[PDB]
């Protein structure tokens, strides 16, 4: 950014690992959420 024109390596590495979690969790979260509603929604 202002010297580390190259963001810190650890910061970048951690961010990628975090992004992977969000990507993997979204499909699962949507699936889990839909089941809960079909399951929880009192008919």
């Amino acid at each position: 950014g202002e010297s580390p024109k190259c963001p810190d390596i650890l910061v970048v590495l951690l961010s990628v690992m975090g992004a992977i979690l969000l990507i993997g969790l979204a499909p699962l979260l949507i699936w889990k959420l839909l089941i809960t509603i079909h399951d929880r929604k009192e008919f």
Binding site: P4, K5, C6, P7, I9, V12, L13, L14, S15, V16, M17, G18, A19, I20, L21, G24, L25, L28, W31, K32, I35, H38, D39
Partner: protein, 42 residues
């Protein structure tokens, strides 16, 4: 002013991908084993 000195060296990007994916695998297996995902309803 030569090697812009990559702000994204190839190794670290590659390494982060493997670690994040490995973590997802363990979480998915754990949820499945607990039946969390088998729980579709009781």
């Amino acid at each position: 002013g030569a090697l812009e000195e990559r702000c994204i060296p190839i190794w670290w990007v590659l390494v982060g991908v493997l670690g994040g994916l490995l973590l997802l695998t363990i979480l998915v297996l754990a949820m499945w084993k607990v039946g969390f995902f088998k729980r579709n309803r009781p």
